[PDB]
């Protein structure tokens, strides 16, 4: 634990977020960068904000902001993208599809 | 409003000085006189974390352990 700067996302945190998104299908972020953690994920809320934001801008997820919340949803191009990133067999799929 | 006057020069950003092959100077071996440490090894970090030989103290960059000489 070498105490790096805040918002210096470790490679272990990014792998945790992708795995949550692939298994589950959707994620809700509740935009505010002062909350220390996500309900279902033990990562600083800011790290989740940046990664989905990057995912959104590459046309992998679409979202819309009801008052005080985020509501992201994955697409088909996202599914093929992550599987190569996370090295999974070609048969596993997100839950919301089955 | 009025545009402020800048008579005070810019404070420059701090960038890290670079030295080539830092670990190679840490250990040196002769034809005789095989592997031999030249610095101090930290106490509370994992083995292999050397600590700096400052002017009058020994300091570790990972745990900030400073052990005072003399």
């Amino acid at each position: 634990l070498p105490h790096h700067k805040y918002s210096y996302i470790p490679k272990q945190n990014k792998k945790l977020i992708y795995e949550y998104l692939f298994k589950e299908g959707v994620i809700v972020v509740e935009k505010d960068a002062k909350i220390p953690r996500h309900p279902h994920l033990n990562v600083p809320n800011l790290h989740i904000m940046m990664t989905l934001k990057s995912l959104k801008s590459r046309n992998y997820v679409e979202e819309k902001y009801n008052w005080k919340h985020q509501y992201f949803i994955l697409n088909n191009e996202g599914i093929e993208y992550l599987r190569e990133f996370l090295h999974l067999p070609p048969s596993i799929f997100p839950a919301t599809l089955s | 409003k009025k545009k402020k006057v800048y008579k005070k020069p810019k404070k420059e950003k701090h960038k890290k000085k670079k030295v080539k092959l830092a670990v190679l100077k840490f250990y040196k071996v002769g034809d005789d006189g095989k592997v031999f440490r030249l610095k101090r090894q930290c106490d509370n970090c994992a083995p292999g974390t050397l600590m700096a030989s400052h002017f009058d103290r020994d300091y570790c960059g990972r745990c900030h352990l400073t052990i005072m000489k003399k």
Partner: protein, 213 residues
Amino acid sequence: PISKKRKFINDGVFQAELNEFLARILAEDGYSGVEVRVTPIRTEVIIRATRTREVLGDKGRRIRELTSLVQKRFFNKSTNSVELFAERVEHRGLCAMAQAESLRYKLLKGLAVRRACYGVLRHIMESGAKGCEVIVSGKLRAQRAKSMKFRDGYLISTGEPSKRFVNTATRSAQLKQGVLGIKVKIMLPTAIDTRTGLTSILPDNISVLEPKT
């Protein structure tokens, strides 16, 4: 263990967010309303819409994402409490939201403003309405704003009956030159079930029966 005052407020505020969240996901599919039934076993949410085919998706795939979204937002405490049901509107010619969403859709394609209002008026009166009214305001042609009113039939503005027998909706459309306001008021066929649950077919008319021959 909160009190009744705090509990009633929490549920009313809960329904405000959910209705506003779905109108953004289901904007283009004729959204009309939601009724929430929170049972201790499992909580049910009923969706009313016009084009239910696109709402469910292929093999009900998108409703499962909606179920996963609602459950992580409002019911993060548990893991299985919610499902979502879809329903088709009985009479879509009298749903003010359905028409306002319909009129809005045309205006973003570039249809003539006068034809679209006439088209919506004719469909509404075809479905048995006793009266209707449409209003559009904004930058129509010039740089100065103006409002256009279209009426057909009979309408009421004052009193208690105006709240019961009249249906209302409001929407807005974002053009490249600004924002346009769409207002639809539909006067339902005069039934409008009453205080004592019963159809009040006649609001104020005092018709006299024909004496038996």
